[PDB]
CSV table of C-alpha atoms in Angstrom, one decimal:
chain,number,residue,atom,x,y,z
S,1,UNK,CA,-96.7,110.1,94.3
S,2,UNK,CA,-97.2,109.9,90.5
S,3,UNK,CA,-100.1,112.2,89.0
S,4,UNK,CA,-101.3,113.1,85.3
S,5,UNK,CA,-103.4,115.6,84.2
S,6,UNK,CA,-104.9,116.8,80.8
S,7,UNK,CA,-104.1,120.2,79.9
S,8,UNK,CA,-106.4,123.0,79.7
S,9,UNK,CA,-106.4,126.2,78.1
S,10,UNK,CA,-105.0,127.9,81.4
S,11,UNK,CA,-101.4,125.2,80.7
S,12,UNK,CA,-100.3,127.1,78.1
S,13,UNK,CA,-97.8,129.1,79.9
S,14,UNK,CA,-96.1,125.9,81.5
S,15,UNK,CA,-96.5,123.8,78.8
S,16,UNK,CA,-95.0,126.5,76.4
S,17,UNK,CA,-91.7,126.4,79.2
S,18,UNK,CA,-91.8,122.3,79.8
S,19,UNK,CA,-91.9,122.2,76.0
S,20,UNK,CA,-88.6,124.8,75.0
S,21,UNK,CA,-86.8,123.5,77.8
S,22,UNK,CA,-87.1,119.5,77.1
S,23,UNK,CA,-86.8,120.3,73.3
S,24,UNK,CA,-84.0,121.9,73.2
S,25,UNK,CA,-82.1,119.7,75.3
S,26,UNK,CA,-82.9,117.0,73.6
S,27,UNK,CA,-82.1,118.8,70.1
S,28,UNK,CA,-79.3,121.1,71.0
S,29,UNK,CA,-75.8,119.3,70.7
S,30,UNK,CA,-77.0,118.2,66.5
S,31,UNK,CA,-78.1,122.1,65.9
S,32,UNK,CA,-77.1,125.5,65.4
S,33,UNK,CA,-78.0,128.2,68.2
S,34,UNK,CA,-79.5,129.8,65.1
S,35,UNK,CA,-81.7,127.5,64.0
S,36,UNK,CA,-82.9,126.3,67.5
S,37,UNK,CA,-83.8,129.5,68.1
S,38,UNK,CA,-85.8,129.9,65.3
S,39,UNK,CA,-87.8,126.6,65.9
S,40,UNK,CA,-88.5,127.1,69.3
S,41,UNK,CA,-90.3,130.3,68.4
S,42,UNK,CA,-92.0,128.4,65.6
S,43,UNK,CA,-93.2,125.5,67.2
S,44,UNK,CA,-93.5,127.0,71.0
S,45,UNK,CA,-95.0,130.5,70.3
S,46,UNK,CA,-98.1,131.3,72.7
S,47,UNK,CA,-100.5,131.3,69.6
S,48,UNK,CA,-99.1,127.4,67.7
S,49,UNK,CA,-99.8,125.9,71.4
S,50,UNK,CA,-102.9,127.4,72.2
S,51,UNK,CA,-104.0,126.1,68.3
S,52,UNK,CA,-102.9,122.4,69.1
S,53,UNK,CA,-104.6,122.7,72.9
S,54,UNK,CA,-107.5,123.8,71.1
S,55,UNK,CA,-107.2,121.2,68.3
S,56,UNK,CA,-110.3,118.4,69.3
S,57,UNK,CA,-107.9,115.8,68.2
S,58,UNK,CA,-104.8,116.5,69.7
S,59,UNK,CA,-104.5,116.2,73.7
S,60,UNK,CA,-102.2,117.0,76.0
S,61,UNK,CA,-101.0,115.6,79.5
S,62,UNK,CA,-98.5,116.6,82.4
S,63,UNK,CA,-97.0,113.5,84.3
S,64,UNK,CA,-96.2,114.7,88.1
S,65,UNK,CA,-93.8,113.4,90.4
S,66,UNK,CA,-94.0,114.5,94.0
S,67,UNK,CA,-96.3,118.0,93.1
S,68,UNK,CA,-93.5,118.9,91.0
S,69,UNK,CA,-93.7,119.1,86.9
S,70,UNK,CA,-91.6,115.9,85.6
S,71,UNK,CA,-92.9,116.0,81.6
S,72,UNK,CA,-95.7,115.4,79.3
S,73,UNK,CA,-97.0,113.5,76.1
S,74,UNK,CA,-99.0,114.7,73.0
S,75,UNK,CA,-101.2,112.6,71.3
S,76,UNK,CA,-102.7,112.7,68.0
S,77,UNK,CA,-105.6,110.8,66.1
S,78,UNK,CA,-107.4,111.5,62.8
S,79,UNK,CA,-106.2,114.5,61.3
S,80,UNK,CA,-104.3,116.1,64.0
S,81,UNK,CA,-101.3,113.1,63.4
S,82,UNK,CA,-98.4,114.6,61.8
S,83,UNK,CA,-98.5,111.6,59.0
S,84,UNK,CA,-101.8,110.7,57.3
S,85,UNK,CA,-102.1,107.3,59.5
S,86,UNK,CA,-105.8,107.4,58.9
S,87,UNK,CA,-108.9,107.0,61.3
S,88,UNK,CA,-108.1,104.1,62.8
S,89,UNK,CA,-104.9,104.9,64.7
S,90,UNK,CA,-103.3,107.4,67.1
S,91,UNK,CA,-99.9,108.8,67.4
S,92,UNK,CA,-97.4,110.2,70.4
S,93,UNK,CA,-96.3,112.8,68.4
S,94,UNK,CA,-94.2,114.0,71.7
S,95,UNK,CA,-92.9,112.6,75.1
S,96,UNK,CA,-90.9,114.4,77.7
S,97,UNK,CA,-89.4,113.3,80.3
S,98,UNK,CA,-87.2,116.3,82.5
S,99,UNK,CA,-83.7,115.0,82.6
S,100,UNK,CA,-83.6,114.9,86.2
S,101,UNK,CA,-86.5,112.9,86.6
S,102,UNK,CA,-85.3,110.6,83.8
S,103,UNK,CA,-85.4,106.4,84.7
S,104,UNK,CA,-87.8,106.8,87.2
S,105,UNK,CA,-90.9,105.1,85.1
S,106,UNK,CA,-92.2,108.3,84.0
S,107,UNK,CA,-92.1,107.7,80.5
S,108,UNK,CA,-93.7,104.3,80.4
S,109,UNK,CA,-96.8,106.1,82.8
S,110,UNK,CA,-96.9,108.6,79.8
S,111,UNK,CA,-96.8,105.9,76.9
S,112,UNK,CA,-99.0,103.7,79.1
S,113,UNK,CA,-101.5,106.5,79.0
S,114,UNK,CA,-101.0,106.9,75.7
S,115,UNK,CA,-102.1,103.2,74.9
S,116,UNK,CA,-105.0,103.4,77.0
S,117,UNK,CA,-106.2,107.0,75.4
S,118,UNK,CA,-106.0,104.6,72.0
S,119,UNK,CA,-107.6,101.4,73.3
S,120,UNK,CA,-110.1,103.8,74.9
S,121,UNK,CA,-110.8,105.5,71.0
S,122,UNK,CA,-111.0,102.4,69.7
S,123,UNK,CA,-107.7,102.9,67.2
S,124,UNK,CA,-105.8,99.7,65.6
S,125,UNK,CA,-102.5,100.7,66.5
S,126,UNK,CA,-100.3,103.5,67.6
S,127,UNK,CA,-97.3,104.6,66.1
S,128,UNK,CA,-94.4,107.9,66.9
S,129,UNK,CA,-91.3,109.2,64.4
S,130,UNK,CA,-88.4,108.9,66.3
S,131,UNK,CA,-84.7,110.5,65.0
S,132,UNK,CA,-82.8,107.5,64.3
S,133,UNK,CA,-79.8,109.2,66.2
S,134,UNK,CA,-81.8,109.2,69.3
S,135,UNK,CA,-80.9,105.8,70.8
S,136,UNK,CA,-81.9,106.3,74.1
S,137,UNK,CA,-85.7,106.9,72.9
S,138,UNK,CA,-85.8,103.8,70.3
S,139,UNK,CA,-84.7,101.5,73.4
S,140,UNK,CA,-87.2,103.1,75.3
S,141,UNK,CA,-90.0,102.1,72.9
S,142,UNK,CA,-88.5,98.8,72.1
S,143,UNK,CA,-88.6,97.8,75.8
S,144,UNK,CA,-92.4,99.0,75.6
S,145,UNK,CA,-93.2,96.9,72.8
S,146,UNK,CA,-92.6,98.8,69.5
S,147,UNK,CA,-91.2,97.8,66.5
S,148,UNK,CA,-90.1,99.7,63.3
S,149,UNK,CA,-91.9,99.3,60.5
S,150,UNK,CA,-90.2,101.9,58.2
S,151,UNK,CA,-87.8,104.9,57.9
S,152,UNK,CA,-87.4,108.1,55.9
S,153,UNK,CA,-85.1,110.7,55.6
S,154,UNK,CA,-86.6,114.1,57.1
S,155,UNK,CA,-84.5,117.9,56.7
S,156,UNK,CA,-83.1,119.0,60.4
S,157,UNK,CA,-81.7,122.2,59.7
S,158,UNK,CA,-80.1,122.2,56.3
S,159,UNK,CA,-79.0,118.7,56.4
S,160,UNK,CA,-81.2,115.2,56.3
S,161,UNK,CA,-81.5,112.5,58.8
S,162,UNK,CA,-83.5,109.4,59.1
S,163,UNK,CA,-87.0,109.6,60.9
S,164,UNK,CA,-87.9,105.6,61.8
S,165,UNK,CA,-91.6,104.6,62.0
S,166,UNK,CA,-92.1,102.8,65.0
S,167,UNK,CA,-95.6,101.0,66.0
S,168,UNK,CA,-97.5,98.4,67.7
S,169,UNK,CA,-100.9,96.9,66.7
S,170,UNK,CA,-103.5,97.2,69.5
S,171,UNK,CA,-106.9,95.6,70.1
S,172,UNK,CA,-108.5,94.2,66.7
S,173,UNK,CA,-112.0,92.5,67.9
């Protein structure tokens, strides 16, 4: 059956490995060896993860499929969003799905949850920066309802690439 769970202090370990491993096959055909390497100590190291588990406005979640580890989501409101969105909304900075358990409605569970977790907080709307390359993931977000409402270029590596603004507005009243 499918589970989730919020992570805890005592995830860190398998987060840390769920996040390298789904990163970097997402990432690793557009970049050096080099500079993979270098991000995934940046952004994975034991001490950047326990900050963000610890961070009260960031929250993690593990989506399970059968026992076994499928992915996770990260969610962001206030000041823990990675664009200054303001108070009122709340952002999937990250959503993982393992290849192998890919097209099985594990991601929508994860966005789903992420949509209640902002109806829940009360936010306006919820929005994610997604690699315009990545067409795969902007389908995926079309089909749930998303629509982009901007774009900017963004520095991967040493060379720029467009980062599009995707969102949808939630419950107003």
């Amino acid at each position: 059956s499918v589970k989730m769970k919020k992570c805890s202090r005592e995830d860190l370990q398998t987060l840390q490995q769920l996040s390298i491993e789904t990163f970097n096959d997402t990432f690793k055909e557009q970049n050096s060896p080099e500079n993979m390497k270098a991000y995934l100590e940046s952004a994975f190291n034991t001490e950047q993860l326990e900050k963000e588990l610890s961070n009260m406005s960031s929250q993690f979640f593990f989506i399970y499929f059968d026992h076994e580890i499928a992915g996770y989501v990260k969610v962001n409101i206030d000041d823990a969003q990675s664009e200054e969105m303001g108070a009122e909304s709340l952002e999937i900075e990250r959503i993982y799905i393992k290849n192998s358990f890919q097209k099985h409605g594990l991601g929508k569970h994860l966005l789903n949850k992420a949509i209640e977790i902002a109806l829940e907080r009360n936010k306006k709307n919820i929005w994610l920066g997604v690699w315009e390359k990545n067409e795969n993931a902007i389908a995926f977000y079309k089909k749930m309802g998303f629509v982009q409402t901007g774009a900017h270029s963004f520095y991967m590596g040493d060379e720029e690439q467009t980062d599009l603004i995707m969102a949808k507005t939630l419950i107003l009243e």
